[PDB]
Each structure stands twice: as C-alpha cells, then as structure tokens.
Amino acid sequence: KTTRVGVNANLRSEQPVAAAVSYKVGTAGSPSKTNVVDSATNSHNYDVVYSSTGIANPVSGNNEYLVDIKENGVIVATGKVAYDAATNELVSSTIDYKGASPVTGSMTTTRINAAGTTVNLADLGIVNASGADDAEVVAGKLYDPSTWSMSDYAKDNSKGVKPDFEVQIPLSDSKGGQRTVTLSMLKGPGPNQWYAELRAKPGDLANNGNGQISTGIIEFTTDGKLKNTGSLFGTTSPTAITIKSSGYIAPTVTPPAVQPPTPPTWADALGIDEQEVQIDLASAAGGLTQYNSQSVVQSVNTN
C-alpha cells in the first residue's frame, strides 16, 4: 500500500500559455479592437487578453477574470474584472495603467498612462452596449478549476481543458490493486506560475464523477526551483493527500463547525481502505523543477 511518492520531473519554463488559459479576443492576424480613441483624441489598436484566475468562479457572487490590454505586444493596462454571475453585468474593475499605484479602477474606463489618459471599457469589449458585458470573455471558454477543468477533460475530452503536462502516480491500494492518481498542470498567466490539479481516475471516487482530488496554483523561483504549492495539498506538512475509505461517511458537524466539502472518497465498488499519501515534490536529488528544457517525467519514486 503506497504511503509516499516522490515526483522527479521538469516543467518547461518557456511553455507558452494555452488559449484556454489566456484568451486573446478576435481573429488571428488582426488586433482585438481597432481605432479605439482615448481621452486625448489619439486612436489605438489594442489586443485584449482575458485570463483565467485559476480560482473557482463564482467568487462572492461574481465571475472573475484577469485582463491585459496590449498595444504592439506591450501591456499598457491590466487588472481584474468581475461580472455578476446571474445577470452578466460588469460589477467591478481594477484595470489601470501598468505599474499604477495606488490601483484606481473604473466602471467605465481604464487609464492607459500615468498622465491619466483613458479609454472606454466598452470600446475594449469589457463592457457591452448591445448585450451581456461578459459576452466576449464567455466566448473564450476559459479554464476553471471547478466548472471547466483538467479533470472535466479527463472525463470528457470535449469538456474542460487539456493539460500542458501530466505526471502519472500509480498507487497500490489496500488490496494491492493499482489506482492511478494524476498531477495535471497548465502554464498560468503569471511568471513561473502553473495551475495544478490532483485527480483520481474518473469514477474511482464516490463523491464526484470526474475524479478531482484537489486544485492549486504552483509557483517556482526565477531559477526554476519549487517555491510553493498553494492549496494543492491544503495546509498539510509534509505535503500529502488523504482519500477516504470506500463507504466513508462524514459525520454531521456540530454547528460552530461547518460541513467540509465532501472529501475524496474511494468508490464503493473498490472496497478499499483510507489512503493517506505523502507527495514529495521537493527532494534533494529530484523534485518538481521549472528549467528551460523539455517537459519530462524523470521518475516517480514510491515506497
């Protein structure tokens, strides 16, 4: 029965972001938006890039997305937008000129320089005069760790998002059978940043259909060394996951405590025991690295 795994693999640092993670509005070979006039009567052509936050939407009643505004491949403005999850209206924007401080968002504009020149969000398609404000970002069908994920893709290849890289982790269960756990990852929009999911085979868990175990944002140093794993392993130390026994029922909580989301639980049919597994991504000889070389699994150690 597997209790500890060591992942030895490299993720190529120059791996380009997938369109499903960072979506440029419009057709290939032409700017997203043309002849956008700023408050100083100057016209621009802009690229508009919506990016997934890597954090499950909705957040406090809103669908949140990252936004970059680019001119000739240079970011002139950036921030986060939040659309009402029910009504699809823009609710808040932190889009401001790049490097701005303090960040000063607007429901109708963004600054494009420190001098305070602005453009209209509507001319960028971030707001919609003839429909739902979120129409153009919704068209991008962006990654979501909860509703449009790599685990969704594993279950149905027409759904969710295909990973940039995967590490398969074979577990021996309490019966000696082999359960495959997979670490699925996407290059994130941030520097040295990746979106990650841990997942069992779809159907191997009783508590969902796609087999997702956990999700998290993984960060690397500028030198390609693992920096942190976000909430991928929760707050465990050492980093670990626990998959509950077949037939495990979480007791009803006593109400200062709140009922935790149903934890990963082995399918009834498997009839196997709780499996707590340390997952070591930072060993001295190996570990999960992010150098500019081929994405590759060097080896996976198990006990």
Numbering used by the authors: 167 to 469
What's the paper's own text on this?
The hook, a highly flexible universal joint that connects the filament to the motor, consists of about 120 copies of a single protein, FlgE23. We examined the structures of large inserts in the FlgE sequence by solving the structures of FlgE from Caulobacter crescentus (C. crescentus) and C. jejuni. Both FlgEcc32 and FlgEcj79 contain completely different extra domains that are not present in FlgE from Salmonella enterica.
This fragment, called FlgEcc32, lacks the N-terminal 166 residues and the C-terminal 122 residues. Domain D2 consists of β-strands organized like a rugby ball, that is completed with some long loops. This domain is made of two parts that consist of segments Lys167-Val183 and Pro329-Asn469. Similarly, domains D2 of FlgEcc32 and FlgEst superimpose with an RMSD of 1.7 Å, and domains D2 of FlgEcc32 and FlgEcj79 superimpose with an RMSD of 0.9 Å. To make a model of the hook, we manually docked the atomic model of FlgEcc32 into the density map of the hook of C. crescentus. The relative positions of domains D2 and D3 of FlgEcc32 need to be slightly rearranged to obtain a relatively good docking given the low-resolution of the map.
